[PDB]
């Protein structure tokens, strides 16, 4: 039964599965007389609970129920290859040795003698290259990509962060060669202002789950972890030191070849003229972010509506690029 609240008042039982714990911060209770473990039903179930603070032997029955299923997205063997990541092969080679290699032939490290990094850190412009690039390498590895958005872990609620991270390693032990991805680790991190200055263990015990499971016990090639940040200085140096987070992937600007492969894919979804040539207009534009490349395809149709054309001619793409050049200059 789902338990979002538990309390008891003035109950005399018996030492063995006694409970009598008030989960509210007012009138806190504990349990003495030895140690007992009852993960299924401690005494009555129901109003037996734990919630925030740890009390004695109550640990085997945590309140793990929560409608957070909309946060974690589990996708096994994604089919995404190149959409907006066209031209990122420079970063794919960075993810080829530390991701594709241990997830394909992990036995090579026995002859090499070295070890795969416990984690891979992503870096670059905010909101660009940290999404589809992680699923692109997951296809070649035939691994399980689990994306957990850190926006719901921003809460200071006690036990929220350490509970979801613990469940990721549990499901990773069942199936080998899985990828655990943490979206926006800046929203989680190793320490924040509400951890030390506050009386909450949120993020305080969450880093322990990454230290105990990943580096401490669980293997490397079978269970991998990937992070994405907007800056390394927002992470606890304890996790930043080598042995946990080693490689740092930086998103650069694609070249002309990368822009050509992205435009030809979008040209299938959007109506375009059969006589346009993307090897020219794209060359007139300098190196730009992957987010601005999708803007060129969307803005090209806007000038076509003003020009009243069923498709986008070569002059329509020229006005869309000039709008990006004048407003960005990147």
């Amino acid at each position: 039964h789902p338990l979002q609240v538990a309390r008891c008042t003035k109950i005399i039982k018996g030492e063995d599965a006694k409970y009598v714990i008030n989960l509210k911060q007012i009138a806190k209770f504990v349990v003495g007389l030895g140690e007992r473990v009852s993960p299924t039903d401690i005494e009555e179930g129901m109003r037996v609970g734990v919630d925030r603070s740890k009390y004695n032997i109550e640990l085997p029955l945590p309140p793990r129920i929560d409608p957070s299923v909309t946060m974690m997205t589990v996708e096994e063997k994604p089919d995404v290859t190149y959409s907006d990541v066209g031209g990122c092969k420079d970063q794919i080679e960075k993810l080829r040795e530390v991701v594709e290699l241990p997830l394909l032939s992990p036995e090579r490290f026995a002859t090499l003698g070295i070890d795969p990094p416990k984690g891979i850190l992503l870096y670059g412009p905010p909101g660009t290259g940290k999404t589809l690039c992680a699923r692109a390498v997951a296809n070649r590895t035939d691994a399980t990509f689990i994306r957990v958005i850190g926006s719901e872990l921003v809460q200071k609620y006690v036990g929220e962060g350490a509970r979801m991270v613990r469940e990721l390693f549990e499901m990773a032990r069942t199936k080998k060669a899985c990828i655990i991805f943490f979206d926006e680790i800046d929203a989680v991190g190793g320490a924040r202002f509400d951890d030390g200055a506050g009386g909450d263990n949120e993020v305080q015990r969450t880093m322990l789950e990454l230290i105990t499971q990943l580096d401490g016990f669980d293997p490397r090639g079978n269970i991998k972890v990937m992070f994405a940040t907007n800056r390394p200085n927002t992470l606890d140096p304890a996790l930043l030191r080598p042995g946990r987070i080693d490689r740092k992937v930086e998103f650069s600007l694609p070249d002309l070849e990368g822009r050509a492969n992205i435009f030809r894919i979008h040209s299938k979804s959007m109506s375009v003229e059969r006589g346009i040539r993307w090897e020219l207009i794209s060359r007139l534009c300098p190196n730009s972010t992957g987010a601005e490349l999708r803007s060129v395809c969307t803005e090209a149709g806007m000038f076509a509506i003003r020009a009243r054309r069923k498709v986008a001619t070569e002059k329509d793409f020229l006005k869309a690029v000039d709008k990006v050049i004048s407003g960005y200059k990147k």
Partner: protein, 363 residues
């Protein structure tokens, strides 16, 4: 009254069996709350605003598919048992919630802004009034619109004029209300904005005068805040996750976009940047024609006479200048401004107002 007595009245009067006793056995009292979790075992968890959080059971009223956690339902006071389900609009979402219907402003009352009307129309009104144009092109219309100007002209007249032609409810959210100075209120209030407009979508989201969440700086000082950094990221996920044909748009206007998060910018979601421009003399002729329809003018003064002297005024003070033009006529005891009044009224306006002088005497 006659129809309801011969139709709806005998329906309830003739046959009474069920639906009367459904609200009895469970309980008479009602205490509104929110469902924490729903299951098939006929038990759930409810929490009222007074926080009497308990563990209760469920009786069959509506199917479990209609019961969703996070919505206000029909409950009991003492036993806190679920007696039914209610509407979710009773759940407080944003501290400042303003829903305006039938906006007064339109494209005809904003003057010579047609240069900027076609811009705001293509990114908002055109996908709403012509969804087939963006569908045949195989592209997604821009959801966001960036505006520049001053409140009352640039950031006001342009926002309310579009909601009139689109026949959409005006929904205003103050930019400072997005950050409540409490951790977790940033992502919560942003998701509730798209929830009200995410059912029938008979409205458009409008946000004006952002001096705060638009700038996170590097830290929680110097005008920025730490909660702003993580709030603008969730708004990006809610912007990309939001998918429609353009019935709902998000229009935000600030002074400077240089301090915005490049993530929330997300080129291709916002294709529209409208900068405030200085209107020409043709703009004043459209604003005068509205008030001259009521206030009578002399035959010796036409629209070309008043537009002669115009110094750095777009649309706002043309009404304010005509206010003094009608106030001076009250001193002469007349209800119709004539040629003698126009000359003396405009001199009291154009003069003694702007102290700084932009002049070509630098030589």
């Amino acid at each position: 009254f006659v129809s309801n007595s011969e139709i709806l009245k005998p329906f309830e009067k003739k046959q009474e069996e069920e639906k009367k006793q459904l609200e009895e056995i469970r309980g008479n009292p009602l205490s509104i709350g929110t469902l924490e979790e729903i299951i098939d075992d006929d038990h759930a968890i409810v929490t009222s605003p007074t926080m009497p959080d308990y563990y209760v059971s469920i009786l069959s009223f509506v199917d479990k598919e209609l019961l969703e956690p996070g919505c206000s339902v029909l409950l009991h006071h003492k036993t806190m048992s679920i007696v039914g389900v209610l509407q979710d609009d009773a759940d407080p979402m944003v501290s400042v919630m303003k829903m305006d219907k039938s906006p007064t402003e339109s494209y005809s009352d904003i003057g010579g802004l047609e240069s900027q009307i076609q811009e705001i129309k293509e990114s908002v009104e055109l996908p709403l009034t012509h969804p087939e144009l963006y569908e045949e092109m195989g592209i997604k219309p821009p959801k966001g619109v960036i505006l520049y100007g001053a409140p009352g002209t640039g950031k006001t007249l342009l926002a309310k004029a579009v909601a009139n032609q689109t026949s959409a409810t005006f929904l205003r959210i103050v930019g400072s209300e997005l950050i409540q100075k409490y951790l977790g209120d940033g992502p919560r209030l942003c998701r509730q904005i798209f929830k009200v407009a995410g059912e029938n979508a008979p409205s458009i989201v409008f946000i004006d005068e952002i001096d705060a969440i638009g700038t996170k700086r590097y830290d929680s000082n110097s005008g920025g805040e730490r909660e702003i950094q993580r709030t603008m990221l969730e708004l990006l996920n809610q912007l990309d996750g939001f998918d429609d044909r353009g019935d709902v748009k998000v229009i935000m206007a600030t002074n400077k976009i240089e301090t915005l998060d490049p993530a929330l910018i997300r080129p291709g979601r916002i294709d529209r940047k409208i900068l405030f421009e200085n209107p020409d003399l043709s703009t004043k002729k459209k604003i005068l024609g509205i008030h001259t329809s009521k206030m009578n003018l002399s035959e010796d003064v036409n629209l070309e006479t008043l537009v002669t002297t115009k110094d750095d005024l777009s649309g706002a003070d043309i009404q304010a200048m005509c206010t003094e033009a009608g106030l001076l006529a009250l001193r002469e005891r007349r209800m119709q401004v004539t040629a003698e009044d126009f000359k003396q009224a405009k001199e009291r306006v154009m003069k003694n107002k702007v102290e700084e002088n932009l002049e070509g005497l630098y030589l």
